[PDB]
Amino acid sequence: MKLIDKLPSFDRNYIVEEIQGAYDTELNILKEDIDDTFNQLFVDTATWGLDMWEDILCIEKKELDFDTRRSNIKAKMRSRGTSTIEVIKSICEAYTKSETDIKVYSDEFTFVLSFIANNCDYKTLLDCSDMIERVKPAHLLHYLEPII
Amino acid sequence: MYSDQTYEVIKNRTLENINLDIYKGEGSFLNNMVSGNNLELSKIYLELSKMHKMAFIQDTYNQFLDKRVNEFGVYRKLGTESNGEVEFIGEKGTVINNGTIISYRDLLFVVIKDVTIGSEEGDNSPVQALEVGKKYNLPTNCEFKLVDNISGVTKITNTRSFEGGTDIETDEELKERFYKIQRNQATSGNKAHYEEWALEVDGVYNVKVYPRWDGPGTVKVLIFGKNNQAVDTETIERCQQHIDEEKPIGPTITVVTPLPIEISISAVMKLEDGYTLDNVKESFLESINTYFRDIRGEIIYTKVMGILINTTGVHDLSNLLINGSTDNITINEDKIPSVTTVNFSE
Amino acid sequence: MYSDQTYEVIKNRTLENINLDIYKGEGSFLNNMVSGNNLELSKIYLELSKMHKMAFIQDTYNQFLDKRVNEFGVYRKLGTESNGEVEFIGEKGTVINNGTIISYRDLLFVVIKDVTIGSEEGDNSPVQALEVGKKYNLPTNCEFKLVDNISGVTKITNTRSFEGGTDIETDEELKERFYKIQRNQATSGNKAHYEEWALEVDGVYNVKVYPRWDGPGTVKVLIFGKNNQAVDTETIERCQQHIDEEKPIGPTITVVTPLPIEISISAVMKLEDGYTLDNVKESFLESINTYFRDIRGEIIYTKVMGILINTTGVHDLSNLLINGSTDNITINEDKIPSVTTVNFSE
């Protein structure tokens, strides 16, 4: 439609018009391709691109829906573990399903975790302790104590 | 790059791409289709060049920056409306209801609470800016005017400068803020990181940390209110709870408030004519209060007597005694001199 | 989808979209112009695909990589220049002003301190490298040349080796840092956070962290250079003080560097014709050096003496002893083999 407008007066007949119309349809296809690619540029608008977004994040997994992909990307970046004891204590309680008190001596750097042995099993206790040591400061020394 | 790719260059390229018996000629029908496709392709090249920049973290627009910071979880600041208190002067008993708007020049301001002229509470009512901005932060003594005339109200002026009006945050400000946030992250027990959270408390201004005060891992937090004056106990408690809400794993935290040091002075001085003991007393106590507010380190007896003699109304001075001594008095940490006794005799 | 459309499919699609009684004949100038326009179309689609690639930076390092990395807070560490002190030898009384230009081989250096020959300040002046890189870390007793002709100056040499010349960052190194950080999860006061802290300083390529090595609040940090090489003590000091700046207060930081393991070689071998002892010694030295670069675990006597027999110029060998023995020796942590004595004879 644009080309025929740019076309001269003597080229106003259908014989000229068919090629221009076909090319205009092709260029409409190309411009919607540009639109799709620009959507792919932004992580929120990119649906299929979220996979190699996660690949940039160096985390790989089969995924259901793009909203969860975006949620996982947002969780992956920042989301720094707080220095607060309470957050980690809440996570430990969620794993162990039992309240845990802390008797920490800054002079001793000593951290202690007390919990009912009946509530939480051996394997999940070990996994929670490994996660804690992954998060807990290296200098600080923690100890998990099961209540008999 | 795409700047090199242009109408003429790609046009000639496409013409070369076609092996045909028709000699290339200006204005040819086939030449016409080729030229149109090349024009639109050059436009598309320009679009690609633009989306280079638009895809970058910098040089973004309002929506672009908004999306980026939402991905980062950051949110830009729209600003705050200015807040102040004005005085309504007019017929006594006139009631100005809530929601009334007062205009100073083209600026628009609204009255929060109902105010009655001549009422027991007074004729002063807080007034909030209708919109955000520095322009709404009007200074003191501005003759506000009602947009809608109210019978019994004549003059509206603010006895205090309007404050709280903040502008819309710019893109560069938020970009630099995000870059700083990424560059500097919250750490466990850094002195600056821990002190910043204490600085969030309104009452205190200066914060000091004394680690190892009771062994390893022992942190002694030192605070200072307005010009290093002791804050109230409830302020100390709220600061303690706040820093505990951000404290590292297993710290021992003690908040230390500044202490005052009482000062007793006594001297036998000669007063200038036309001056009484009370006048020289008040002038010298104000001067020495300023000195205490600016004294660094220990007390200097010679400086104290110098500020004494420099005080107006002092013909001569003698027998100057401070806290039972004439020697320089050591000031320890968290200690500020406090004027308590002034024994002046002629 | 850029990859979905290919040259011939869209060519045929464009040909089909032409609805004319004109027969679509292959080799026609019409088909040729369709081919040329489709050639430009394939170019633009491929460039769009490349744009997507450059936006994701799965390969082909780009400025986009640097900017996205800066988004995540990671920033490229340019590096530092070498530092040292040189001795000025020449006529007494000559003054070497600050900023004097001296060149040794291709590298260029600048005098840091204005030094006068024969003065009580001595003839030694500090000199800092003018560029970032390890090449400027010159050894001791190297002779330097004046770029500008100064009367009364004869010799310039350094009493000690030059250090501080950290190498310039490489894009691959930054990419590896970003990727390992992606697997890492830094937390305020975390072992991975400490590892990142160590990685921040230039010259640190491999980081080892040992929690509770001595127990309560005890930090053991082991660092490595390129190819698990030892680092200068200045770099160690900079890294540890930086960590202390960022570390929580209270833990005891301990930073160490790998140390070499000396080895002595004693053997009797039959020299080949046209080969001398020095040539085969140097060739085996290169072989053992690259093997030690590739070694891990323990030194294997059989492997070393077999790479010796495989060396050019080696016909037959006998009574080969490493440190006087033929037994494999464990290469412990923070320890690397070091060639000390080579004893080859016929």
Side-chain angles (χ1 to χ4, degrees):
Chain A
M1 183 278 288
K2 306 303 297 174
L3 298 190
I4 176 59
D5 295 334
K6 302 165 182 52
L7 278 175
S9 64
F10 51 83
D11 286 343
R12 281 296 168 278
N13 60 6
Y14 69 102
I15 302 174
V16 171
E17 293 169 353
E18 312 291 345
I19 316 186
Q20 320 281 3
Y23 273 113
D24 285 1
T25 53
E26 187 276 319
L27 293 172
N28 296 318
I29 302 173
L30 188 153
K31 68 187 62 181
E32 50 194 355
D33 296 330
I34 309 164
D35 181 20
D36 179 26
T37 48
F38 193 80
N39 311 330
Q40 302 158 358
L41 305 186
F42 263 87
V43 58
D44 180 24
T45 50
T47 59
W48 63 268
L50 285 153
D51 53 3
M52 73 290 291
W53 270 106
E54 307 285 358
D55 303 346
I56 302 175
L57 285 183
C58 317
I59 53 173
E60 310 175 4
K61 195 197 60 179
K62 194 264 177 184
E63 206 284 315
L64 321 178
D65 197 342
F66 312 113
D67 55 358
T68 313
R69 287 155 178 275
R70 294 179 267 259
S71 168
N72 300 1
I73 286 175
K74 283 187 294 299
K76 173 59 188 178
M77 51 66 78
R78 55 181 65 257
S79 306
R80 169 169 302 288
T82 74
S83 69
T84 68
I85 321 169
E86 168 58 29
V87 165
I88 316 179
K89 281 177 63 63
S90 56
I91 312 168
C92 303
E93 184 162 359
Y95 280 101
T96 64
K97 296 307 179 183
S98 63
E99 61 86 20
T100 296
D101 52 352
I102 48 171
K103 193 186 64 177
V104 184
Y105 304 96
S106 297
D107 187 6
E108 296 180 5
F109 290 98
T110 290
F111 201 88
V112 58
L113 298 93
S114 310
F115 39 81
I116 309 179
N118 294 318
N119 289 138
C120 187
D121 298 358
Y122 198 98
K123 176 60 60 184
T124 177
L125 266 176
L126 175 55
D127 309 347
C128 182
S129 175
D130 303 350
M131 183 278 288
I132 294 153
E133 178 73 9
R134 167 63 204 104
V135 185
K136 191 263 292 178
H139 50 278
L140 301 186
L141 72 165
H142 86 277
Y143 292 94
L144 72 164
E145 183 70 16
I147 296 172
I148 64 181
Chain B
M1 61 79 71
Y2 308 156
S3 61
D4 192 12
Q5 306 286 355
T6 191
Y7 181 76
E8 175 269 331
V9 162
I10 70 184
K11 170 77 159 48
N12 190 13
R13 165 188 290 101
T14 313
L15 260 60
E16 297 144 357
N17 298 341
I18 309 159
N19 185 11
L20 73 165
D21 292 331
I22 295 89
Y23 175 61
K24 309 167 180 181
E26 155 73 9
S28 291
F29 159 68
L30 189 64
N31 189 358
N32 288 136
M33 283 74 74
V34 181
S35 64
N37 299 304
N38 291 303
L39 196 61
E40 304 201 8
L41 288 160
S42 305
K43 261 73 176 176
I44 297 155
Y45 265 106
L46 304 179
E47 306 291 345
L48 213 52
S49 306
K50 299 150 198 168
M51 61 215 288
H52 281 283
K53 300 288 97 176
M54 294 182 286
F56 278 127
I57 180 58
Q58 72 273 26
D59 63 36
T60 54
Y61 308 90
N62 45 6
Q63 57 178 357
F64 290 72
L65 173 76
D66 186 17
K67 304 155 190 176
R68 302 305 282 101
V69 302
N70 293 321
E71 300 164 4
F72 311 144
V74 191
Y75 312 106
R76 211 192 43 67
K77 306 177 180 305
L78 273 296
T80 60
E81 289 80 11
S82 184
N83 297 278
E85 180 175 82
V86 304
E87 184 180 25
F88 303 84
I89 297 174
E91 179 198 359
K92 189 181 174 178
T94 308
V95 171
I96 302 104
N97 47 304
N98 49 0
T100 50
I101 56 173
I102 55 173
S103 57
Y104 187 81
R105 312 282 82 77
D106 58 334
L107 277 298
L108 298 180
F109 291 85
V110 69
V111 174
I112 296 92
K113 71 169 285 297
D114 305 350
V115 64
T116 310
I117 302 177
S119 69
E120 295 84 5
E121 289 177 5
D123 311 334
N124 289 353
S125 180
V127 165
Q128 159 194 9
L130 277 187
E131 293 84 10
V132 299
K134 284 328 174 301
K135 64 183 181 294
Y136 287 98
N137 272 352
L138 274 184
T140 183
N141 301 316
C142 297
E143 293 79 4
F144 291 85
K145 178 61 179 174
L146 293 172
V147 190
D148 305 320
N149 270 334
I150 294 173
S151 296
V153 178
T154 67
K155 183 179 178 179
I156 313 174
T157 178
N158 64 316
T159 42
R160 52 208 48 82
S161 295
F162 270 62
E163 292 177 355
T166 55
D167 295 355
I168 297 169
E169 180 179 11
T170 81
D171 306 337
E172 312 85 1
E173 287 152 356
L174 194 68
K175 291 174 181 179
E176 174 183 357
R177 169 191 175 188
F178 159 75
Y179 290 152
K180 170 188 175 184
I181 286 174
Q182 278 284 356
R183 179 74 267 163
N184 305 333
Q185 66 278 16
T187 63
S188 165
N190 187 29
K191 203 177 196 301
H193 281 92
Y194 200 89
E195 272 163 352
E196 171 192 3
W197 315 321
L199 289 162
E200 310 170 5
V201 181
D202 47 357
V204 291
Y205 290 80
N206 178 20
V207 181
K208 169 66 175 66
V209 168
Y210 286 103
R212 201 70 183 253
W213 70 276
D214 201 73
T218 61
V219 166
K220 167 174 306 169
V221 181
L222 174 56
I223 67 172
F224 294 100
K226 179 165 295 303
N227 198 359
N228 299 6
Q229 275 68 244
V231 296
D232 64 77
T233 305
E234 190 171 0
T235 295
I236 300 177
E237 299 165 1
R238 60 178 276 179
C239 180
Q240 175 72 19
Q241 272 70 245
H242 180 73
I243 64 188
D244 289 10
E245 298 292 345
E246 271 83 4
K247 68 184 185 182
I249 307 286
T252 61
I253 305 304
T254 65
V255 167
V256 183
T257 184
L259 314 178
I261 285 302
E262 61 87 20
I263 307 297
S264 61
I265 207 164
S266 60
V268 183
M269 73 291 291
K270 301 291 108 178
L271 299 188
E272 304 275 11
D273 67 319
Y275 279 69
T276 68
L277 272 173
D278 71 90
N279 301 134
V280 63
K281 262 180 182 180
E282 61 199 359
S283 303
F284 169 68
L285 70 86
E286 184 185 7
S287 302
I288 201 66
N289 285 331
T290 310
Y291 173 72
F292 291 161
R293 286 174 287 170
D294 60 56
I295 183 177
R296 316 293 104 199
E298 322 176 357
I299 307 172
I300 315 171
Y301 176 81
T302 56
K303 288 297 193 290
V304 169
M305 61 79 70
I307 205 164
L308 182 45
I309 177 67
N310 292 141
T311 304
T312 318
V314 182
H315 176 265
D316 204 12
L317 72 164
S318 61
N319 305 112
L320 168 65
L321 197 70
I322 308 160
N323 285 352
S325 167
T326 71
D327 301 327
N328 284 345
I329 289 182
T330 301
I331 302 182
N332 294 139
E333 301 188 3
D334 305 339
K335 295 185 182 178
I336 56 172
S338 168
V339 162
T340 53
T341 306
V342 172
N343 300 324
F344 286 3
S345 57
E346 193 163 3
Chain C
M1 187 66 204
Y2 39 82
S3 53
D4 182 25
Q5 320 294 342
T6 180
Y7 176 91
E8 206 67 18
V9 172
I10 64 193
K11 170 91 169 68
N12 197 9
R13 196 185 326 170
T14 48
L15 280 194
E16 292 146 358
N17 290 129
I18 303 163
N19 188 7
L20 274 301
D21 54 351
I22 297 89
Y23 71 103
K24 279 73 177 175
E26 284 77 5
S28 172
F29 52 91
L30 171 58
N31 209 1
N32 292 138
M33 61 79 71
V34 182
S35 77
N37 271 352
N38 178 32
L39 188 145
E40 191 67 21
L41 197 52
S42 56
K43 287 188 171 180
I44 192 166
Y45 271 81
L46 185 145
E47 183 65 4
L48 181 51
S49 185
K50 175 178 179 55
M51 181 65 148
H52 189 269
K53 302 162 188 175
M54 296 299 102
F56 275 88
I57 309 95
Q58 69 275 19
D59 197 358
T60 311
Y61 64 98
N62 292 311
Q63 316 82 16
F64 298 81
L65 179 155
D66 298 332
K67 301 185 181 177
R68 299 308 88 94
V69 166
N70 295 348
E71 298 172 355
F72 287 99
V74 187
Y75 169 66
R76 171 182 303 181
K77 295 300 294 181
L78 188 63
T80 69
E81 313 84 15
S82 194
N83 306 333
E85 182 163 79
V86 300
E87 179 198 24
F88 272 89
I89 293 167
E91 175 194 350
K92 187 185 170 182
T94 61
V95 187
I96 301 100
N97 288 302
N98 192 0
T100 314
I101 310 177
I102 45 176
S103 67
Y104 160 76
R105 311 277 73 72
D106 53 345
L107 307 172
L108 193 62
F109 284 82
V110 55
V111 175
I112 310 300
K113 176 256 296 178
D114 174 23
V115 57
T116 298
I117 283 184
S119 71
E120 274 170 347
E121 307 171 8
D123 288 28
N124 289 293
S125 181
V127 163
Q128 180 177 53
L130 278 173
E131 294 179 1
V132 179
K134 200 257 181 181
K135 60 198 68 57
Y136 286 85
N137 292 311
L138 304 184
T140 181
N141 290 318
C142 290
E143 193 160 337
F144 304 90
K145 303 179 180 180
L146 291 173
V147 163
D148 56 355
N149 279 319
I150 308 174
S151 184
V153 193
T154 64
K155 180 173 182 176
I156 297 169
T157 187
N158 62 324
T159 64
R160 67 182 181 274
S161 60
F162 274 47
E163 282 190 354
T166 55
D167 195 9
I168 317 183
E169 202 84 8
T170 74
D171 298 332
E172 307 81 359
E173 278 279 355
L174 183 147
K175 180 183 182 299
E176 303 298 345
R177 288 189 174 180
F178 180 73
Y179 270 62
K180 64 190 299 182
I181 284 185
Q182 281 291 337
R183 276 83 66 191
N184 291 317
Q185 301 81 13
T187 304
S188 298
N190 199 352
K191 62 94 176 179
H193 211 282
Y194 270 90
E195 174 165 3
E196 189 274 341
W197 280 338
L199 185 56
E200 292 167 333
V201 189
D202 275 322
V204 186
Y205 301 81
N206 321 305
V207 184
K208 295 299 303 307
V209 186
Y210 311 89
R212 278 77 51 86
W213 70 295
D214 294 350
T218 70
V219 191
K220 189 61 219 70
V221 170
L222 173 49
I223 57 176
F224 304 93
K226 63 91 176 179
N227 310 139
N228 296 351
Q229 274 317 112
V231 286
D232 60 83
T233 184
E234 181 180 2
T235 296
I236 300 178
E237 294 157 355
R238 299 173 315 180
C239 180
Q240 65 87 31
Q241 62 86 23
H242 181 92
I243 290 179
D244 299 1
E245 290 170 357
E246 266 88 7
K247 82 158 191 178
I249 298 174
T252 298
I253 299 300
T254 309
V255 183
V256 298
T257 188
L259 73 165
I261 304 182
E262 301 323 296
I263 205 72
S264 66
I265 311 161
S266 71
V268 177
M269 61 79 71
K270 192 259 183 179
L271 276 77
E272 286 185 352
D273 304 338
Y275 291 97
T276 299
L277 193 63
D278 289 345
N279 305 118
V280 293
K281 264 192 185 177
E282 292 163 9
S283 302
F284 168 67
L285 276 170
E286 311 305 325
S287 76
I288 194 62
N289 288 321
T290 186
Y291 167 62
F292 283 170
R293 289 295 93 209
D294 282 328
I295 198 167
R296 195 270 315 156
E298 322 197 4
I299 49 176
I300 308 181
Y301 156 82
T302 59
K303 291 221 179 204
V304 178
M305 61 80 71
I307 202 60
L308 181 49
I309 185 63
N310 292 146
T311 316
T312 317
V314 180
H315 177 275
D316 200 0
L317 59 85
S318 58
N319 61 269
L320 188 152
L321 300 157
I322 54 170
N323 275 2
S325 163
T326 67
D327 298 331
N328 300 350
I329 297 178
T330 311
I331 302 168
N332 303 329
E333 281 193 359
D334 62 89
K335 287 183 185 185
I336 58 170
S338 165
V339 174
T340 314
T341 302
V342 175
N343 189 359
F344 293 154
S345 60
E346 198 165 19

